[PDB]
Design a protein. Structure first.
Ligand code: GDM
Length: 215
């Protein structure tokens, strides 16, 4: 018998609103979700990279600085793994939903006024939530040098959970799994995703591997 403690958290009110907005509104061009996944991976990779300049020991958990992108049609998932800095449990609790952040209300206001469109979400520091343009459920596995591996999960609806992660160890970094909406499964088509990764990684300084799963 396996045993696991799972903690449930409620999204901050504005974050809940933003998630409903991203989910319950039709947006015709959703490819920003991929730009954001890759940009966030790159940011996390930058952070560990710069940390390694002043402290070489930070890389001992995983030497490679790389991104892996894994479309899996059978599983209806898109997975993006980085070997960046990773996030502690508290990092994920604080930054993946409980704490109100500086750009949330401003983004929502600009969405409604037309000052911003959905593709500009990243500028407001809430680009993670763009995953809900294409996914019903998002799972974030993360491993920071200062903590054990944890797994965050949400299907929106106002709550997330976080638990000690007993799945494949990352060494260091973050593995985000998007459980794709039935209407957005075309994002798992091999050629489509390969080419979109090319399109949205033009300024990325880290190796990317595209691993297409066949079952
Ligand atoms: C400048 O940093 C960014 C912030 C500030 C803050 C959260 C940074 C975070 O603090 C713990 C780490 O320093 C950073 C390395 C981790 C990531 C980028 C994670 O990505 C991966 N692959 O690790 C991302 O994972 C889903 C987590 C939150 C992202 C959010 C909520 C977002 O919507 N936009 C943001 C994008 C950013 O670039 C954002 O708010």
């Amino acid at each position: 018998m396996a045993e696991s403690q799972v903690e449930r958290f409620t999204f901050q009110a504005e974050i809940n609103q933003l998630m409903s907005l991203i989910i319950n509104t039709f947006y015709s061009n959703k490819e920003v979700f991929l730009r954001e996944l890759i940009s966030n991976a790159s940011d996390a990779l930058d952070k560990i990279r710069y940390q390694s300049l002043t402290d070489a020991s930070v890389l001992e958990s995983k030497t490679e600085l790389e991104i892996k992108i894994i479309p899996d049609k059978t599983a209806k998932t898109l997975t993006l793994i980085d070997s960046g800095i990773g996030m502690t449990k508290t990092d994920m609790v604080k930054n993946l939903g409980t704490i109100a952040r500086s750009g949330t209300k401003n983004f929502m206001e600009q969405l409604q006024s037309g000052a911003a469109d959905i593709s500009m979400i990243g500028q407001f520091g809430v680009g993670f939530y763009s995953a809900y343009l294409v996914a019903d459920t998002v799972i974030v596995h993360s491993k920071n040098n200062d903590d054990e591996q944890y797994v965050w999960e949400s299907s929106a609806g106002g709550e997330f959970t976080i638990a000690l992660d007993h799945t494949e160890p990352l060494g260091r970094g973050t593995k985000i799994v998007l459980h794709m909406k039935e209407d957005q499964l075309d994002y798992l088509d091999e050629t489509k995703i390969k080419n979109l990764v090319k399109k949205h990684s033009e300024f990325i300084q880290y190796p990317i591997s595209l691993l297409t799963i066949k079952e």
